[PDB]
Design a protein around this ligand. Structure first.
Ligand code: YWP
Lengths: 99, 99
């Protein structure tokens, strides 16, 4: 689809078999979701945002469907203010900026 | 143009007679730029993201040129680690997400 930006580009995603809402975030290198339960192994990691750094749980090679488009990649889980889909997954679904 | 997201979507902007690099950021409601001593009246504000909040100065009706596309709107200035062009200005240059 073509998504204008007068509203937040929020989309429904499916991860771990559960539906959620997430923000398409071209300013994020990585995908960071709020606290949740995900199966499998994970490693501690740090990520920095506008306000500093936080601790997150890094889940690698995770299946995630974004607005009907499938991706398999890294998902960070931690105290983010909102679920953000970052460039690591936006590239998988073929997302580009256009103007 | 069409910007792929393999790398950060950085572009040259002109603001307050200065050239700078900034991210086209669909995840930012508004625009936040590095400390710069702009003229005019301003209003203190707090903006938050990953890692917490930072203090910024809100300037209204600021002219910005983004890849030769002129825009005018609110610009927040402060100790942000990165310059982000937010949706308030992206809509003005006709920017969309596409996949
Ligand atoms: C020199 C580099 O220093 P750092 O590395 C951090 O640099 C950064 C910092 C911020 C960003 C942009 C943000 N991306 C981001 O957080 O991405 C995370 C995840 O992926 C990683 O990649 C980049 C960082 C990691 C995001 O797009 C936009 N945000 C909102 C989202 C979170 C809902 S917002 O910025 O918080 C924001 C809040 C309020 C407003 C009002 C005005 O509307 C406007 C913007 C990109 C790189 O270290 C720490 C200093």
């Amino acid at each position: 689809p073509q998504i204008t930006l007068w509203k937040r580009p929020l989309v429904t995603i499916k991860i771990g078999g559960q539906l959620k809402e997430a923000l398409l975030d071209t300013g994020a290198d990585d995908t960071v979701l709020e606290e949740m339960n995900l199966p499998g192994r994970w490693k501690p990691k740090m990520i920095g945002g506008i306000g500093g750094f936080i601790k997150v749980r890094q889940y690698d090679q995770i299946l995630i469907e974004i607005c009907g488009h499938k991706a398999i990649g890294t998902v960070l889980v931690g105290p983010t203010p909102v679920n953000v889909i970052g460039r690591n997954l936006l590239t998988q679904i073929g997302c580009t900026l256009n103007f």
